[PDB]
Each structure stands twice: as structure tokens, then as C-alpha cells.
Amino acid sequence: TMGNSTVLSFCAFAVDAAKAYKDYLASGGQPITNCVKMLCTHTGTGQAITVTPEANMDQESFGGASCCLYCRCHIDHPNPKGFCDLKGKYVQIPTTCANDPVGFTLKNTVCTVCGMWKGYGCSC
Ligand SMILES: Nc1ccc2ccccc2n1
Ligand SMILES: [Cl-]
Ligand SMILES: [Cl-]
Ligand SMILES: [Zn+2]
Ligand SMILES: [Zn+2]
């Protein structure tokens, strides 16, 4: 209820933007909205980050940059290269977590074997 710009400004200027958003969520803060939801059939591979939407029946698909805290905050990505894994791609979010795609991508890691989210889609 505070608004996306209010939350994103708070996280953007924090020394640790990821910790700012995680602590905000843990405090009961309403997730960031206005992520770009994709029209899909839910018959996809269910892999986490894809060239085209790949949601299975347990997922929703979103535009990648819209679900990236660093993209949404207009700040550098936290790696030497400043590379973004999500920009220009589509991200599959478990339906149970799809009320907060930005928090989900921030908190989770892609399985290097099967390419699905560890602890969710991944069955390795
Ligand atoms: N995951 C999933 C399955 C079926 C849907 C139907 C309509 C909207 C969203 C859906 N999501
Ligand atoms: Cl907005
Ligand atoms: Cl998943
Ligand atoms: Zn990004
Ligand atoms: Zn796996």
C-alpha cells in the first residue's frame, strides 16, 4: 500500500538493496507489483529463465527485467560484469510465489543440471 516507487527508492539507495527488499517483505510489506505477466498456455518446459515463456501448470511467466530488483531500481547488478540473468528473457515463477516475482528471483537459484529453480521445479 506504500507504492512501488516508495519501496524501490528505499531499496535503490540502500547499501544492500537485496537485504532492504528481503527485510521489507519479512516486516509484512506488500510486494512490488506491475511485473509484466505473459499470456501463455502453461504447457512449457518449466525451466526457470527462457528465450520465450515456458510456464508449466505450476508456474506463471513474466518479462524478466520487470521481475529483477536491480533492473526495477535502475542500479548496477551485483557481479563484476554487472550482467543481468533476467533482462531480455522470460522468468517462470511458481504460482505459490507469483504474488512476488521480484522477491522470488532475488531469493532463489537456478539448478545448473535441469535449469529449474532449486527447491521448487528442480527434481535433481
Ligand atoms: N498456472 C496456471 C494454470 C492455469 C491458469 C489459468 C488461467 C490463469 C492462470 C493460470 N495459471
Ligand atoms: Cl509503477
Ligand atoms: Cl519452479
Ligand atoms: Zn536485472
Ligand atoms: Zn535440478
Swiss-Prot record:
Q: Locate the residues binding Zn(2+) 8.
A: C111, C114, C122, C124
Where does the chain bind Zn(2+) 7? C68, C71, H77, C84
Q: Where in the cell is it found?
A: Host cytoplasm, Host perinuclear region; Host cytoplasm; Host endoplasmic reticulum
Which residues are in the ExoN/MTase coactivator domain?
4-124
Q: Which function does this protein serve?
A: Plays a pivotal role in viral transcription by stimulating both nsp14 3'-5' exoribonuclease and nsp16 2'-O-methyltransferase activities. Therefore plays an essential role in viral mRNAs cap methylation.
Subunit architecture: Forms a dodecamer and interacts with nsp14 and nsp16; these interactions enhance nsp14 and nsp16 enzymatic activities.
How is this protein named in the record? Non-structural protein 10
Species this chain originates from: Severe acute respiratory syndrome coronavirus 2
Taxonomic lineage is: Viruses, Riboviria, Orthornavirae, Pisuviricota, Pisoniviricetes
The part of the entire sequence present here spans 4263 to 4383 of 7096
